[PDB]
Amino acid sequence: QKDVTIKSDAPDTLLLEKHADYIASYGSDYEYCMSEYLRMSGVYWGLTVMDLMGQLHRMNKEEILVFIKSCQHECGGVSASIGHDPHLLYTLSAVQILTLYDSIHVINVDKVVAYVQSLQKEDGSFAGDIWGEIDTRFSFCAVATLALLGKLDAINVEKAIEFVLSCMNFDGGFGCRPGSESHAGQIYCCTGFLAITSQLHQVNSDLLGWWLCERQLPSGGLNGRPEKLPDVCYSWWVLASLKIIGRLHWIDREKLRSFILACQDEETGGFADRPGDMVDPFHTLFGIAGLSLLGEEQIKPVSPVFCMPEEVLQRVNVQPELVS
């Protein structure tokens, strides 16, 4: 019922060069400084999408590596920016970036590992930081961080799996915490987690795949849960989730591709949220990643688990078996 209406003069072509220039020039504004609190992940999104486009060289490696080492704290966790507090989210993003650059010993890897280990609870869950918020988002951040580092064995993996599975719901999806409602962003985190821990046989793929594919609205866009508007973010999460579980074909690939292309800004470059809305590096990554997963030959193959070039993951020997 709730859906966006794509206009007849929205883009139907892929504007790679416009997006690269948008990302290459992003950072030289208002909501840029308002978003200092997620700078580290913001850097991940730009770097990653540039590399998916073969344009990684146009970014400032040396500068970014220094920024990273200055964001690691004495507990070993990493903050979003300098002077901000450590969190699992920005620890993931920093390790994803360090792995894009083959430069993980820029930080203290043993300290990161201990930090991630310190945040696991009795019931297998992870807190995001010392202030104790529990969320399956952080279960993914911990095992994703640890596997890019080759240190999955450092945490109680069985208890972690058990917790994530206790967050599985009547519709085959997952939420934040036990009892929490199913949501596409949480489904992505949990299916990504289960991929990494080798537990995809515990997902009801036909039931969860059905829930996922009912996300696609007549516009071709996907929403994150019932009754919501479609957008490019939810479009990445759902698709990536479907691919992990072997069910990417349960979606109308053509209609989704066209939705995503309608989200491009043909003047400024970048991707937006929904068609003709204002662009950003978050939706630029997930638009490009989404189009790569659908089979765009101009874009490098993207991992639906880590949302990083497959070729990056191949180098470091971390490639989860997916369903099918």
């Binding site: 019922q1 208002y30 400084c33 308002m34 609190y37 997620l38 903050s79 979003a80 002077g83 901000h84 507090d85 969190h87 930081d129 202030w131 104790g132 918020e133 969320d135 719901n169 009547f170 519709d171 939420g175 934040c176 915490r177 009892g179 929490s180 409602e181 199913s182 949501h183 036909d206 795949g209 059905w210 829930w211 594919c213 009912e214 696609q216 007549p218 849960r225 019932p226 009754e227 069910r247 074909h249 349960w250 979606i251 109308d252 209609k255």
Partner: protein
């Protein structure tokens, strides 16, 4: 447009200047009231700025050991008010909601009934606010509320409005708790009656169709005569509803799943008919439906090889 530009440029100067002063104050180790006013300014407009919620917590922790019981009690009531004003403006920030649990989790006697009432307020504003429902589940647990009132609470909310996916999900977790088995038929039947009601009232209501599919799986023929008659009755009601909504895909799918639930082999011809009508109405789900149909035609082949 220039006044809108210039004011936001200043809201900067003010967001930027305040942020700067908070961090200055932090290295210094000035864990005081100064910091709470500055963060009060920044967190109101950007409550996703997580570090600052941490500062607030740090200040409040320090002042539980420089101020009196009374002074510290006043601080938390002031914190509660601040939080509620932060939620009115952004009811969906993770940090705001977690700061509220943090605060309440460390109080002596917290007023949990007040907090349950707050959730009921926020849920009439947005019945789909998952952060509010998660908070409600936290308050219910912290206050040993029983699954029956929460289940009574859910009865209300469905009939009252049509934003029920969140309410039906809560029901799906509450009912297992009323009958803790490592669903009873009498219960299943009662729930089957709530749900059809809901989807004949409003057939475009996708949440009930999803809850209903779960109910169908939830525990052949060991079909009692009651369940068998209830399912048969459900099947004809959907045919009735199909004549009224030829475009409605949810009742078409349900018809297929009802026949499966009744007798795969006996209803095989009509299942095949139903898949074609359905693929014609919901073409985006063409591939899912073919795969479902293949799965059932395999099951139908296994069932036929069990013969004599």
């Amino acid at each position: 447009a220039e006044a809108k530009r210039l004011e936001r440029e200043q809201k900067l100067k003010l967001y930027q200047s305040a942020t700067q002063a908070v961090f200055q104050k932090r290295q210094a180790g000035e864990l005081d009231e100064s910091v709470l006013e500055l963060t009060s300014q920044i967190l109101g407009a950007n409550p996703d700025f997580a570090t600052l919620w941490n500062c607030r917590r740090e200040v409040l922790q320090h002042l539980e050991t420089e101020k009196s019981p009374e002074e510290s009690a006043a601080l938390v009531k002031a914190e509660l008010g601040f939080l509620e004003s932060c939620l009115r403006v952004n009811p969906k920030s993770y940090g705001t909601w977690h700061h509220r649990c943090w605060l309440l989790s460390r109080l002596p006697e917290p007023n949990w009934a007040r907090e349950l009432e707050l959730c009921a307020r926020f849920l009439e504003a947005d019945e789909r606010n998952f952060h509010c429902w998660d908070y409600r589940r936290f308050v219910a647990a912290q206050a040993a509320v029983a699954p029956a009132e929460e289940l009574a609470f859910t009865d209300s909310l469905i009939t009252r409005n049509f934003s029920n996916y969140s309410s039906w999900h809560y029901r799906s977790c509450l009912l297992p708790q009323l009958h803790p088995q490592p669903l009873p038929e009498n219960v299943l039947l009662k729930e089957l009656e709530l749900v059809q009601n809901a989807f004949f009232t409003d057939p475009n209501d996708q949440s009930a169709w999803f809850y209903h599919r779960w109910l169908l799986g939830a525990g052949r023929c060991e079909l009692s005569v009651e369940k068998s008659t209830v399912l048969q009755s459900e099947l004809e009601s959907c045919k009735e509803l199909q004549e009224l909504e030829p475009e409605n895909k949810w009742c078409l799918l349900t018809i297929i799943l009802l026949m499966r639930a009744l007798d795969p082999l006996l209803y095989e011809k009509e299942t095949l008919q139903y898949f074609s009508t359905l693929k014609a109405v919901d073409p985006m789900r063409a591939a899912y439906l073919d795969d479902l149909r293949s799965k059932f035609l395999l099951e139908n082949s296994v069932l036929k090889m069990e013969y004599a």
